[PDB]
Amino acid sequence: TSFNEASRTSFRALPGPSQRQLEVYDQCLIGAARWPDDSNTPENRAYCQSMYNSIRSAGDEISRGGITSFEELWGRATEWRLSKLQRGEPLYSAFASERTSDTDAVTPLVKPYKSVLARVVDHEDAHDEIMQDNLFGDLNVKVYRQTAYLHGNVIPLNTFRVATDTEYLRDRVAHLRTELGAKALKQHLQRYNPDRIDHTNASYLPIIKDHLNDLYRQAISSDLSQAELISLIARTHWWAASAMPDQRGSAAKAEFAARAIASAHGIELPPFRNGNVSDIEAMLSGEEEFVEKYRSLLDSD
Ligand SMILES: Nc1ncnc2c1ncn2[C@@H]1O[C@H](COP(=O)(O)OP(=O)(O)O)[C@@H](O)[C@H]1O
Known part of the structure; x- marks a missing residue:
């Protein structure tokens, strides 16, 4: 025009x-x-x-x-x-x-994202699943898998992981925080924090x-x-x-x-x-x- x-x-x-x-x-x-x-x-x-x-x-x-x-x-x-x-x-x-x-490509669900933990756990589309980690070993996580429809291709966008074994995690961290040190831990925890968004x-x-x-x-x-x-x-x-x-x-x-x-x-x-x-x-x-x-x-x- x-x-x-x-x-x-x-x-x-x-x-x-x-x-x-x-x-x-x-x-x-x-x-x-x-x-x-x-x-x-x-x-x-x-x-x-x-x-x-x-x-x-x-x-x-x-x-x-x-x-x-x-x-x-x-x-x-x-x-x-x-x-x-x-x-x-x-x-x-x-x-x-x-x-x-x-x-x-990861966002650890710690402060200020703490309020996301609930939203995932209580998500009507979240599904219990077993996550495998080289450190924590196997963990029970509530997982929400965001997907999208594009030209007939259904692709995965964001994935929310939320570890549910509270007590077990407290202990795993304490042990690791001594076997790797606060430093090495945070690094691995920057990509593999039990609670995270991939x-x-x-x-x-x-x-x-x-x-x-x-x-x-x-x-x-x-x-x-x-x-x-x-x-x-x-x-x-x-x-x-x-x-x-x-x-x-x-x-x-x-x-x-x-x-x-x-x-x-x-x-x-x-x-x-x-x-x-x-x-x-x-x-x-x-x-x-x-x-x-x-x-x-x-x-x-
Ligand atoms: N100084 C600021 N004051 C208020 N809101 C801000 C400020 N800086 C960023 N934000 C907002 O907070 C959110 C975080 O921005 P985002 O670009 O996704 O963050 P980052 O890449 O830093 O993780 C957005 O909603 C953004 O507009």
Whole structure:
């Protein structure tokens, strides 16, 4: 329909960021973690406020054909994210880089993720299973295996492991903490902590990134009802958060992208309800159920 000279791409004009804006109080909640087990310093509030401003700005770009692919949106999300990193940060590179096969893909379910232990144990789709470890030996774990449907191929995304033999673990740790030392232990425990999330294999990123581009293409249509629109946004958020494309910062980028797309359509999405951590809520569910409850995870609506 229209043509953007700057990027040399035709597009369909959309209603940029609405003029009605979230209350400055909610603006400072956008992109915040908000763990149910409890962190709102002037910094945390400024970080969120900034995410809010940049979200609407990228949404403005999208509505003008300035951003033309998901990959491009993810890039704007990454650059905003990197701007919040302290000068000379050694982690800077992890926040700017995509994840690969021989790299970190595990999140030990310790503080601040403690509240995930319950969600897994009580998960209607979790199944008892026996985990084999070179250290702890065999353990009884409640396991939730997140999967996705893609072109007829059902793939495994995130896997949650939660050891159930409490007493036995206390003793195993005590013994090991003396046979390997607090040091060697933490290293092995960085990848094999009884309670952990084994993230999506990086080998699936390419088809997932392509799928995210396909949802973006759909999401920027000018003839979508707000019901069809909200669904697409929830899906995009689901796939992005569950894929965890980058070595670091995926949840911020994922939420940023999802809200940038909504913002391009005028939708001013309020922050997530206290206790509702978007990426985790996504990793703990199937695509369809996540889309169904997306609205309820947000404040008003
Ligand atoms: N300074 C901060 N204040 C408030 N929330 C933050 C801050 N930094 C990051 N977050 C948020 O907390 C979550 C963790 O981000 P994520 O990128 O997945 O983490 P990491 O790669 O560091 O594990 C996201 O919801 C993110 O937007």
